[PDB]
Amino acid sequence: SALRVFPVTTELSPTDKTFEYMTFDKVGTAQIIADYTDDLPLVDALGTSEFGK
Amino acid sequence: QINASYQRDMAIALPGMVADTSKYNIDGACVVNEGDVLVGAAVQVVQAQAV
């Protein structure tokens, strides 16, 4: 029943050997400030990937 | 009668005022803890939060 328990997709060509998928993320923060402030915190983003055969 | 003309000069500075606009730096993410702080007086840092 392994073909009915889990989904079966169709995305790879008959000549493929490897597939990849990506992921993204972000970081950052915030603070309480005053009238004159020059120290605002910053933010950034990320990324990563995986492989299959 | 002889007329008169009077002239007075402004003061130069106030306590805690920035003197020259030459490459300063201001920290505004501080908080006063357990006391009062006068303008134009030095301060000290008791504890800086980690996160």
Automatic annotation (TrEMBL), chain A:
Name the UniProt record assigns to this protein: Major capsid protein
Species whose genome carries this gene: Escherichia phage FCWL1
Upper lineage: Viruses, Duplodnaviria, Heunggongvirae, Uroviricota, Caudoviricetes
Residues of the full protein shown: 55 to 107 of 319
TrEMBL record, chain B:
Domain of life of the organism encoding this protein: Viruses
Name of the protein this chain belongs to: Decoration protein
Organism of provenance: Escherichia phage FCWL1
Span of the entire protein shown here: 3 to 53 of 158
